[PDB]
Design a protein around this ligand. Structure first.
Ligand SMILES: COc1ccc(S(=O)(=O)N[C@@H](CC(=O)NCc2ccc(C#N)cc2)C(=O)N2CCC[C@H]2C(=O)NCc2ccc(C(=N)N)cc2)cc1Cl
Ligand code: NA
Ligand code: NA
Lengths: 9, 249, 26
């Protein structure tokens, strides 16, 4: 359900 | 529960344990220093459910308010250096000593939205851990036994240990306490699935500081009449907390 | 050393909407 986090992390 | 949306910066020590793949909330947690996060052991290890995460399996998201949103410029996302579970955590019977620490890869920068909670000392615990005294719990867990849009908060009174014991067939220990309203008290509210590992805090009237007295641990359903939420007794396990931080950073 | 003091509340002497409920119970 979660917005995509920075690929960095 | 039966809670309300938190205010911005109301719980700047609140941490979300986040699962890397697939992306989803795992548990709550709390910031106790710039590199240490406190949670429930069952968030990390629960063999009956085949739960056994390791460091590389997750992320710590700090400074959050919204449940799902990427909160750009506000939250910080941290990696796990290492996980420490209480060596006498009792996952087979009753979740006794349901506590874990997590060391971060690099220190987190404090902000308006990110700030550590205090851990109680013996006198603040004696002073504050009294039947009828209210604490506050926060989390992004179930609203009923959907999922919230932002962090939820409820104030709940500590319950006498006899009432706690009589409310369950589980063997309660000195390393737990329970909190919540009685049937007759009218009002209600509780933590629920998803709030696990988050903090039960109290505001000391002596120095006006917030202390984390409990960790969300377990319950028989959520906000059922005559049932209570059970919390790890942080002060009772402080000896172990200090040893971990002493020896490991 | 500043633990437990919230930047947006205690640090500015602002109270949140329900902390008084806690005080009243103590
Ligand atoms: C090993 O120790 C256990 C194992 C299980 C249970 S439980 O009572 O079953 N609850 C279990 C979960 C479950 O099976 N519930 C379904 C359920 C529904 C209704 C009734 C009734 N009446 C009883 C049970 C639980 O909390 N736990 C099983 C493993 C981890 C922990 C958990 O999920 N914790 C999350 C949590 C946090 C807070 C609350 C709360 N209401 N305050 C509830 C759950 C308690 C202990 Cl202490
Ligand atoms: Na009982
Ligand atoms: Na209840």
């Amino acid at each position: 359900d979660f917005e995509e986090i920075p690929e960095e992390y | 529960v039966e809670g309300s949306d938190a205010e911005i910066g109301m719980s700047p020590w609140q941490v979300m344990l986040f699962r890397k793949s697939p992306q989803e909330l795992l548990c709550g947690a709390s910031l106790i220093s710039d590199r240490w996060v406190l949670t429930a052991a069952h968030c990390l290890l629960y063999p009956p459910w085949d739960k056994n995460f390791t460091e590389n399996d997750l992320l710590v998201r700090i400074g959050k308010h919204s449940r799902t949103r990427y909160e750009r410029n506000i939250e910080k996302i941290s990696m796990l250096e290492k996980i420490y579970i209480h060596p006498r955590y009792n996952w087979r019977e009753n979740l006794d000593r349901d506590i874990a620490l997590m060391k971060l890869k690099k220190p987190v920068a404090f902000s308006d939205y990110i700030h550590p909670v205090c851990l109680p000392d013996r006198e603040t615990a004696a002073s504050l851990l009294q039947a009828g005294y209210k604490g506050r719990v926060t989390g992004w867990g179930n609203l009923k036994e959907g999922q919230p849009s932002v962090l939820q908060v409820v104030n709940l009174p500590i319950v006498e240990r006899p009432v706690c014991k009589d409310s369950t067939r589980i063997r309660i220990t000195d390393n737990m306490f329970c909190a919540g309203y009685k049937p007759d008290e009218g009002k209600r509210g509780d933590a629920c699935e998803g709030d696990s590992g988050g903090p039960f805090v109290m505001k000391s009237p002596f120095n006006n500081r917030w202390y984390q007295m409990g960790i969300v641990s377990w319950g028989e359903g959520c906000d059922r009449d005559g049932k209570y939420g059970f919390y790890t007794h942080v002060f009772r396990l402080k000896k172990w907390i200090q040893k971990v931080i002493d020896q490991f950073g | 050393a500043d633990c437990g003091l919230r930047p947006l509340f205690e640090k500015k002497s602002l109270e949140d909407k329900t902390e008084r409920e806690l005080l009243e119970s103590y």
